Amino acid sequence: GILQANRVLLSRLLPGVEPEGLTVRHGQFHQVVIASDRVVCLPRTAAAAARLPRRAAVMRVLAGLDLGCRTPRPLCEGSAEGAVELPFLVLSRVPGAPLEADALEDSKVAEVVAAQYVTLLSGLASAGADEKVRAALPAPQGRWRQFAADVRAELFPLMSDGGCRQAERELAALDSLPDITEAVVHGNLGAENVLWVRDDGLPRLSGVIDWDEVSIGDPAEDLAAIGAGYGKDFLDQVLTLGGWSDRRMATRIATIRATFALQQALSACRDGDEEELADGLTGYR
Amino acid sequence: MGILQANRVLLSRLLPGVEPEGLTVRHGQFHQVVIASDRVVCLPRTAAAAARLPRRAAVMRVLAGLDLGCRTPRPLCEGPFLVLSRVPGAPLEADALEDSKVAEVVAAQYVTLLSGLASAGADEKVRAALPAPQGRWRQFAADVRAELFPLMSDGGCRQAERELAALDSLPDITEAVVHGNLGAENVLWVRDDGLPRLSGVIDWDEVSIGDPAEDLAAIGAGYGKDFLDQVLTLGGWSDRRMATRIATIRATFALQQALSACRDGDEEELADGLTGYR
């Protein structure tokens, strides 16, 4: 038990809470323990521990952006960012729940939901043109070519020959992608990481969670995630309202969206999440 | 007509599909605030407040990026209006501190918030964006003599002058971000999931670069000196010279209330604030 292993530390961070009653999501680097109003990241390795000082900074930068919504706020002191290593990192919990695709069948909901996606993405785009933001966030080069290699190395062994051939087409298209480093890119903006309130009216975007893969990147990565989850008609509505329906943007989205399930499977592989892996490899084995 | 109907176009955009008559509105400090489930809409009463509202959004954006150990109201939208996130939780009842396990834990979380506020004193966005007025206590001393002494007994006037003299002798410190109104009501907690956890702080209307003793005095007013002593000892603020600045600011709280209520046309607060001075 990740909760049992870490019993003493949690009793200090969450005094008077039974750790058995808490929930856990798995990350690549850290395990996130989920309490009622806040989340505790626990590093899995020393290298993960050495990453948390930069995480605190990243999350503080995000907390100051104009996204039209909330983000998980670092509850540490600022000085934590100067550390070599943190043994944990506490963040505020964003309220709300995922929006199921069915709710987009109502036309006026779809419009209001798309509008709020545009505000978020517009804010991320413009923040990616800020030099202080760009200096605080990772901005790797050749991420597509290297993602392809990682899929072949880590996922192909789990696939069928037919799955390997489907994936090869999808991954080869990547090499032709311009390597764009223009926007703040969430990098895993599936519906599960986007939280809404539906208590007093039409859906209102409350916030966005799971920023582990955030970078300076190509906004087409986030728009592909949306299109993977909600399909072409809703994606087109977001592109129109945002001013992103050009053929160039739309081609990068198409290319990236064809890999989005492999992205989820690679993440599930690395964080040990078996059902998430089985789901992501549907049609490849 | 009323505020909801009058502003209904705007609220239909900001709160789509939300029946306006189901909302609650609070009278505020040059600000009408429409409360929705997860956010509030700030509308300026006065044309002066409409002019100053872009600046308030800016301050709230800066506070949203500070490391205070808790939530603050985040600007979600601006236009004239300002939409802020609502902070979850509720004030802590002074009675909760009878439990000494609760008292230590609440005290420690106050230390984090005050430390964060102190540290942010040196931040560039902070010192740029937040008001940092000079002569605060001399200007208030003149305001009191002008507006309140005419309402006071002569013995009251003696007492106030003794408290206003003490206040003049204090150094004009602009080191920390100061909430400026850090009473029990404005600090929100998560209860009934174990021991109390600080969720966030609201009502930043009077926020400035100033002297943290003001915030410590407010904590003292709300919860008493035993709880405040616990905070000062944990935070390493238990020296002589801090204790004097607190006690001196603390002594002016009824006068501050009287002066506010005297201006705002609130006769209930005025009489209560003037209690020992007439």
Author numbering:
A (entry chain B): 2 to 286
B (entry chain A): 1 to 79, 88 to 286
Publication excerpt:
In this study, we focus on a resistance gene cph, which encodes a phosphotransferase (Cph) that confers resistance to the antituberculosis drug capreomycin (CMN). To confirm whether proteins in cluster I also confer resistance to CMN, three proteins, Cph001 from Streptosporangium roseum (accession number: WP_012891209), Cph002 from Streptomyces sp. The polypeptide chain of Cph001 is folded into two domains, an N-terminal lobe domain (Met1–Gly97) and a C-terminal domain (Ala98–Arg286).
We then performed mutagenesis on the codons coding for the conserved catalytic residue Asp189 to generate the Cph001D189A and Cph001D189N variants. After multiple attempts to obtain the crystals of the wild-type Cph001, we switched to focus on the Cph001D189N variant, which is more stable than the wild-type and can be crystallized at 4 °C. Crystals of Cph001D189N were successfully obtained in a week and the diffraction data were collected at National Synchrotron Radiation Research Center (NSRRC) on beamlines 15A, 05A, or 07A. The molecular packing of Cph001D189N belongs to the orthorhombic space group P212121. Two polypeptide chains were found and built in the asymmetric unit. The final model of Cph001D189N was refined to a resolution of 2.3 Å. In every Cph001 structures, including apo and complex forms, the two polypeptide chains within the asymmetric unit adopt distinct conformations: an open form and a closed form. The two forms implicate conformational changes during enzyme catalysis. The closed form reveals that the α-helical subdomain moves closer to the N-terminal lobe domain when compared to the open form.
